[PDB]
Each structure stands twice: as C-alpha cells, then as structure tokens.
C-alpha cells in the first residue's frame, strides 16, 4: 500500500519531477510534483505548441482511455500556463495503479513548458482548486480506491550540491531522510493549499518577522515572503532588492546564520548554503524573495531543508529537518 517515486532535481534546485505512467500499456511522463496546484495535465498529441523533447499522450494508443472532452485551462503564479481537454485514464504512481484518474490533455502550453524538463504537472493541492470543478485529484483517488491506507505522502527534495534527487512516498514516509522526531502542524486548506502559520522568524538572536501565514508549495523554487518580511530578512543578510522579486546576496554564506521559522512550537530552518539560490557571472541571487503576496509561498528553498509528510485526511503535516 505504498508507492515510491524517485525524483529528479532540475538544475540548481529549480523543481523536482518524477515519472508517472499513464494509460494501457502506458506511456511514462516526467511531471513536476506540485503541492501548490491540483490539476494533472500532460502534453498530448492534440497539442499545437508543445516541445519536441516532451512525451505526448495519444488517446488512440491507450486501451483504457475514457473520453470526457470538457475544456480546462490553468495559469500559474510564474506566468506559465496550459490548457486543453479532459479525459480519464489509469495512472500508475510509484506502483499504485489509480483507475480512471481525470487527466488533462494539453492542446496548448506556455513556451516555458515547451522548453523545460516537464511533460506536465502532478497537482498535490486540495481538490477545491482544480480548474474544472469536481475533478478528483490523484490523492483523492488513492484514498477513495483504497490504494493507500494512510492518506499521506512523504516528501524529500534533494540538494543539487549533494547530487540532487528526491523521493515521494505515497501512503508512507521515509525515516532515513530526516532527523529526530516528526512534529505535527495543523493545515488550513481553505484556499486549496497546504496553509500553515509561522509564529516567528529569526536570524541568530534577532526576530525578523512576527506571525505570518504561508503555504507549503513543492512547485515554487524560492521561499517567497510578504514584502515586509522579505525586506526584514534581506536587511538581516545585507541583501539588495533587484526590483524583480529577488535579492542579490553575498555568495559567501560562511558568516550567515540560518533563517529559523518557529512553527507550532518547533524550529525549522533554511540552512546558510540555501540562502543562495543561484550564482551567475559572480553575482548571487538569494533563496528568499517577494512577490506582493499577503502570505508566504514556502517553496523549495525551505523544503529541501525540511522533510514534510502531507496528510490530506486531517488535514495536517508533519515536519522534521532533513538528514544532511
């Protein structure tokens, strides 16, 4: 009752994708696993602007394709998008065979998807934000079909500096990937996301933020903070606003203390190495940013330092520092 999906880390911790087999006999698709959205969409032979490197779903080549035909369309926070028509087919996730999952066949996708590593996305948010109302998500179906007993998935995202990788376990979790005991944290799923409250953020002995809300989003690269929190964190590290939602920060992290979040009475950090996301031409971009959101998007900068068990049933999460 447990599905294991080894992940690939794209570049410098940009995103984490895993293979999913769709159809009968089945084609293998590389999908970005995204707790910030709830649509499972794939490049298809109906697509008019997809990429030559992508695997394309062909309805005629699956014995278990079920027609649906309703339109779907999604737009993501980074400006990427896709759209097309619905269908149903069997979806094998780490060995667990979901029967008749609603899949979303792309007729169009943004150029960034056509030039990227993904054949599509696997949405792991809550079903109240599927772009077509009433679509049941993969986790909904794993639960309702009895393919997993525990309504959970455990998430390890690797660091490119350690060789990359990552691993999702559907129906369980992997204790070899984290330190100490898991801490339970309640989830607010009212906007479709894995919402939490951070009671306080600190750098060393200094408070850099009082309470703020955020979402645990495997499909966002950075730790995106409200502008005032972002600006306070930047001040703590001497970082300079690039005007585009990112900061320039020193490439030498040896004298940086971790950024520590207090969450439900326990501490979870961004490690000092992770305070740098990217180096280009001698300049470093910070692992935290801003985006004019009233809540934080707690993305890969944080998640690659903190193992999370996502529990859809409660809903709640359990968090522990990664073993590293």
């Amino acid at each position: 009752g447990v599905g294991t999906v080894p992940m690939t880390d794209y570049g410098n911790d940009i995103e984490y994708y895993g293979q999913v087999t769709i159809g009968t006999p089945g084609k293998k698709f590389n999908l970005d696993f995204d707790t910030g959205s709830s649509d499972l969409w794939i490049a298809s032979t109906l697509c008019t602007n997809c990429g030559s490197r992508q695997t394309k779903y062909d309805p005629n080549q699956s014995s278990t394709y079920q027609a649906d035909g309703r339109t779907w369309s999604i737009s993501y926070g980074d400006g990427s998008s896709a759209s097309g028509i619905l269908a149903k087919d069997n979806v094998n996730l780490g060995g667990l065979l979901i029967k008749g999952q609603t899949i979303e066949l792309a007729k169009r996708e943004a150029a960034s998807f056509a030039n990227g590593p993904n054949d599509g996305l696997l949405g792991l948010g809550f079903d109240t934000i599927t772009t077509v109302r009433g679509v049941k998500t993969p986790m909904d179906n794993l639960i309702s079909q009895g393919l997993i007993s525990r309504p959970i998935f455990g998430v390890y995202l690797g660091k490119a500096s350690n060789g990359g990788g990552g691993e999702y376990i559907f129906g369980g979790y992997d204790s070899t990937k984290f330190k100490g005991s898991l801490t339970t944290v309640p989830i607010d799923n009212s906007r479709g996301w894995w919402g939490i409250t951070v009671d306080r953020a600190t750098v060393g002995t200094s408070t850099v933020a009082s309470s703020f809300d955020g979402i645990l989003d495997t499909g966002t690269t950075l730790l995106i903070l409200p502008n005032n929190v972002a600006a306070s964190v930047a001040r703590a590290y001497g970082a300079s606003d690039n005007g585009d939602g990112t900061y320039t920060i020193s490439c030498d992290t040896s004298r940086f203390k971790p950024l520590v979040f207090s969450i439900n009475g326990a501490s979870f950090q961004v490690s000092p190495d992770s305070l740098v996301f990217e180096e280009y031409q001698g300049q470093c971009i910070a692992g935290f940013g801003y985006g004019n959101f009233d809540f934080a998007i707690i993305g890969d900068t944080f998640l690659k330092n903190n193992y999370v068990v996502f529990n859809q049933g409660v809903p709640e999460v359990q968090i522990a520092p990664v073993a590293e």
């Binding site: 940009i14 970005d32 926070g77 980074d78 990427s80 996305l121 966002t220 993305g299």
Partner: peptide, 4 residues
C-alpha cells in the same frame, strides 16, 4: 524561479 518557478511559482506553481
């Protein structure tokens, strides 16, 4: 970065 991505924001999805």
């Amino acid at each position: 970065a991505c924001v999805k």
